[PDB]
Design an enzyme around this catalytic site. Structure first.
Site, PDB file in Angstrom:
ATOM      1  N   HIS A 169      -2.712   1.568   6.880  1.00  0.00           N
ATOM      2  CA  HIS A 169      -2.908   1.484   5.440  1.00  0.00           C
ATOM      3  C   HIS A 169      -2.549   2.856   4.862  1.00  0.00           C
ATOM      4  O   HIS A 169      -2.635   3.869   5.538  1.00  0.00           O
ATOM      5  CB  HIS A 169      -4.365   1.092   5.176  1.00  0.00           C
ATOM      6  N   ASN A 200      -8.714   3.779  -2.923  1.00  0.00           N
ATOM      7  CA  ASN A 200      -8.050   2.576  -2.371  1.00  0.00           C
ATOM      8  C   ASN A 200      -7.303   1.880  -3.495  1.00  0.00           C
ATOM      9  O   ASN A 200      -7.511   2.184  -4.692  1.00  0.00           O
ATOM     10  CB  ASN A 200      -9.076   1.699  -1.651  1.00  0.00           C
ATOM     11  N   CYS A 232       0.789  -1.197   0.000  1.00  0.00           N
ATOM     12  CA  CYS A 232       0.000   0.000   0.000  1.00  0.00           C
ATOM     13  C   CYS A 232       0.833   1.263   0.000  1.00  0.00           C
ATOM     14  O   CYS A 232       0.535   2.257  -0.696  1.00  0.00           O
ATOM     15  CB  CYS A 232      -0.980   0.000   1.164  1.00  0.00           C
TER      16      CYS A 232
HETATM   17  C1  LIG Z   1      -0.538  -1.768   3.344  1.00  0.00           C
HETATM   18  C2  LIG Z   1      -1.943  -1.907   4.003  1.00  0.00           C
HETATM   19  S1  LIG Z   1      -2.873  -3.268   3.313  1.00  0.00           S
HETATM   20  O1  LIG Z   1      -1.954  -4.300   2.911  1.00  0.00           O
HETATM   21  O2  LIG Z   1      -3.649  -2.897   2.099  1.00  0.00           O
HETATM   22  N1  LIG Z   1      -3.642  -3.949   4.635  1.00  0.00           N
HETATM   23  O3  LIG Z   1      -4.500  -3.053   5.275  1.00  0.00           O
HETATM   24  C3  LIG Z   1      -4.102  -2.932   6.702  1.00  0.00           C
HETATM   25  C4  LIG Z   1      -3.863  -4.134   7.589  1.00  0.00           C
HETATM   26  C5  LIG Z   1      -4.792  -5.197   7.721  1.00  0.00           C
HETATM   27  C6  LIG Z   1      -4.521  -6.250   8.581  1.00  0.00           C
HETATM   28  C7  LIG Z   1      -3.332  -6.297   9.308  1.00  0.00           C
HETATM   29  C8  LIG Z   1      -2.410  -5.252   9.196  1.00  0.00           C
HETATM   30  C9  LIG Z   1      -2.686  -4.170   8.352  1.00  0.00           C
HETATM   31  C10 LIG Z   1       0.602  -2.154   4.336  1.00  0.00           C
HETATM   32  C11 LIG Z   1       0.404  -3.492   5.067  1.00  0.00           C
HETATM   33  C12 LIG Z   1       1.722  -3.971   5.721  1.00  0.00           C
HETATM   34  C13 LIG Z   1       1.505  -5.320   6.417  1.00  0.00           C
HETATM   35  C14 LIG Z   1       0.974  -5.310   7.735  1.00  0.00           C
HETATM   36  C15 LIG Z   1       0.764  -6.558   8.359  1.00  0.00           C
HETATM   37  C16 LIG Z   1       1.090  -7.738   7.711  1.00  0.00           C
HETATM   38  C17 LIG Z   1       1.659  -7.768   6.410  1.00  0.00           C
HETATM   39  C18 LIG Z   1       1.833  -6.519   5.788  1.00  0.00           C
HETATM   40  N2  LIG Z   1       0.844  -1.106   5.294  1.00  0.00           N
HETATM   41  C19 LIG Z   1       1.961  -0.304   5.348  1.00  0.00           C
HETATM   42  O4  LIG Z   1       2.874  -0.403   4.482  1.00  0.00           O
HETATM   43  C20 LIG Z   1       1.995   0.755   6.445  1.00  0.00           C
HETATM   44  C21 LIG Z   1       1.765   2.183   5.872  1.00  0.00           C
HETATM   45  C22 LIG Z   1       1.580   3.201   6.937  1.00  0.00           C
HETATM   46  C23 LIG Z   1       2.627   3.946   7.496  1.00  0.00           C
HETATM   47  C24 LIG Z   1       2.388   4.831   8.539  1.00  0.00           C
HETATM   48  C25 LIG Z   1       1.083   5.084   9.054  1.00  0.00           C
HETATM   49  C26 LIG Z   1       0.034   4.369   8.475  1.00  0.00           C
HETATM   50  C27 LIG Z   1       0.277   3.455   7.439  1.00  0.00           C
HETATM   51  N3  LIG Z   1       3.324   0.750   7.068  1.00  0.00           N
HETATM   52  C28 LIG Z   1       3.693  -0.422   7.739  1.00  0.00           C
HETATM   53  O5  LIG Z   1       2.908  -1.348   7.914  1.00  0.00           O
HETATM   54  N4  LIG Z   1       5.039  -0.458   8.142  1.00  0.00           N
HETATM   55  C29 LIG Z   1       5.756   0.758   8.424  1.00  0.00           C
HETATM   56  C30 LIG Z   1       7.255   0.519   8.333  1.00  0.00           C
HETATM   57  N5  LIG Z   1       7.663  -0.695   9.168  1.00  0.00           N
HETATM   58  C31 LIG Z   1       9.146  -0.843   9.090  1.00  0.00           C
HETATM   59  C32 LIG Z   1       6.951  -1.893   8.729  1.00  0.00           C
HETATM   60  C33 LIG Z   1       5.443  -1.674   8.864  1.00  0.00           C
END
Ligand SMILES: *[C@H](CS(=O)(=O)NOCc1ccccc1)[C@H](CCc1ccccc1)NC(=O)[C@H](Cc1ccccc1)NC(=O)N1CCN(C)CC1
Length: 254
Positions: free
Chosen positions: A201, A221, A31
């Site tokens: 997300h 989205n 995302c």
């Molecule tokens: C993208 C969101 S999604 O994949 O479309 N899923 O929706 C949210 C969700 C649903 C269920 C469980 C957890 C999350 C990604 C998902 C990353 C992920 C999480 C859990 C398991 C596998 C993958 N989200 C991100 O990249 C977010 C973005 C963000 C940054 C700051 C504030 C809000 C959102 N960032 C992270 O998840 N990171 C940040 C950097 N660190 C090092 C890793 C996690």
């Protein structure tokens, strides 16, 4: 400049087809990279007056940015925009369109919702390798296909600053907190009512509006057109709902 009660980037810049495009991350937590390349595609079209009308490659950013986090396991918005400025990002479409330098490797799937694609399910793909080579039929050198920003920045946590930013320079990327009830969104103006914290997300805010006096942001989205309101959702505006006004990031080509 006066802030209108409603605004939609698609209506201000209809020549920029990317603004109306809904992408699909597939089985990957990319995302962070999707909201970035989407907004960068929109801004490049807007700010260039159409001289750069491209669909930038999610996989180039996802796979090659070393300072951007954990790839398919989650990423960081600021470094994503800095990568665009410093290294640039090549072109690339969806897997299904198989266009541009580096099209996305993963197929469309349904994200906890009904539709014609296979359910995404529980599995997450491994982050693709950073290949830095275009697909065979794409003849422009990878290095030449790079599109770079000039600057990147965080937008102030302030509703009016975010509005002005969008109206002037185009869609922004934003991060928000995912609670369980978000996964059951079908329509309407979202707000957190039930469910525990799941994660975060990253999406693209394209405009705003009001429904029966209730203010919202209009968000694209990256879970394909079958999800939500034709691929979009609306969320409460002006109350930092799910921290939606707290992690807004963007940048400019000039
Ligand atoms: C993208 C969101 S999604 O994949 O479309 N899923 O929706 C949210 C969700 C649903 C269920 C469980 C957890 C999350 C990604 C998902 C990353 C992920 C999480 C859990 C398991 C596998 C993958 N989200 C991100 O990249 C977010 C973005 C963000 C940054 C700051 C504030 C809000 C959102 N960032 C992270 O998840 N990171 C940040 C950097 N660190 C090092 C890793 C996690």
């Amino acid at each position: 400049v006066e802030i209108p009660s409603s605004f939609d980037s698609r209506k201000k810049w209809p020549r920029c087809k990317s603004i109306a495009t809904i992408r699909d991350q597939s089985r990957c937590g990319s995302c962070w990279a999707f909201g970035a390349v989407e907004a960068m595609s929109d801004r490049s079209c807007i700010q260039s007056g159409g001289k750069q009308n491209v669909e930038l490659s999610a996989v180039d950013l996802l796979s090659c940015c070393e300072s951007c986090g954990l790839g398919c396991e989650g990423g960081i918005l600021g470094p994503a925009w800095d990568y665009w400025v410093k290294e640039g990002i090549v072109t690339g479409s969806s897997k299904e369109n198989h266009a541009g330098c580096e099209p996305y490797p993963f197929p469309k799937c349904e994200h906890h919702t009904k539709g014609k694609y296979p359910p995404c399910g529980s599995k997450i793909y491994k982050t693709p390798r950073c290949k830095q080579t275009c697909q065979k039929k794409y003849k422009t050198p990878y290095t030449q296909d790079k599109h770079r920003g000039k600057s990147s920045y965080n937008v102030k946590n302030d509703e009016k600053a975010i509005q002005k930013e969008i109206m002037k320079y185009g869609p922004v990327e934003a991060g928000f907190t995912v609670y369980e009830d978000f996964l059951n969104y079908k329509s309407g103006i979202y707000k957190h009512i039930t469910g525990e914290t799941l994660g975060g997300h990253a999406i693209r805010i394209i405009g705003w509006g009001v429904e029966n006096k209730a203010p919202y942001w209009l968000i694209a989205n990256s879970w394909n057109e079958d999800w939500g309101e034709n691929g979009y959702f609306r969320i409460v505006r002006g109350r930092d709902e799910c921290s939606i006004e707290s992690e807004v990031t963007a940048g400019r080509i000039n």
